[PDB]
Design a protein around this ligand. Structure first.
Ligand SMILES: Nc1nccc2ccccc12
Length: 167
């Protein structure tokens, strides 16, 4: 049993809700919240900008030190950093950004990072300002992630379309 409430069950392991990931993270304090990161961990906008704002910029400060030591992530890659006030850990995952011309086949590689964590609160990778089709992102998620994932979808309209169209 876990703390997640109000989710619709899509599969054995994937759950979805129309919810604010920050507001959801603040309520649940999950072991892992996933960030929709870029390779530079520059948390300007979208999910990343919202998560970072909720940490009062502490996520960005930590991320800048990570990059100064390790250099950029790979598209499809990830790193584990602090969850600050939102979670124990933040798994920063880089999905391909279609608005930069990145290979959408890298979306499966991105989701494979989730399999290193038994339970996660996450957004749909490569959705929103990353430019991919969220219906496609949900399909790749279901077909790739084997651990228990609780997806937060900010937009109610999109939430209802994802559920109605789910095979
Ligand atoms: N805040 C938040 N929560 C879940 C999904 C999102 C997608 C895009 C921007 C913000 C989001």
């Amino acid at each position: 049993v876990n703390s997640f409430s109000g989710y619709l069950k899509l599969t054995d392991n994937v759950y979805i809700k129309n919810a604010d990931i920050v507001e959801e993270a603040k309520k649940v304090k999950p072991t892992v919240v996933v960030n929709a990161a870029n390779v530079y961990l520059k948390h300007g906008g979208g999910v990343a900008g919202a998560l970072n704002k909720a940490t009062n910029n502490a996520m960005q400060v930590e991320s800048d030190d990570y990059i100064a030591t390790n250099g950029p992530l790979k598209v499809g890659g990830s790193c584990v950093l602090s969850g600050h006030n939102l979670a124990k850990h933040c798994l920063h995952v880089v999905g391909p950004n279609v608005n930069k011309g990145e290979d959408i086949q890298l979306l499966k590689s991105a989701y494979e990072n989730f399999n290193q964590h038994e339970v996660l609160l996450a957004p749909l990778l490569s959705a929103g300002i990353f430019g991919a089709d969220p219906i496609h992102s949900l399909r790749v998620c279901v077909d790739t992630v084997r651990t228990n994932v609780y997806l937060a979808v900010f937009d109610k309209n999109l939430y209802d379309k994802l559920v109605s169209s789910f095979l």
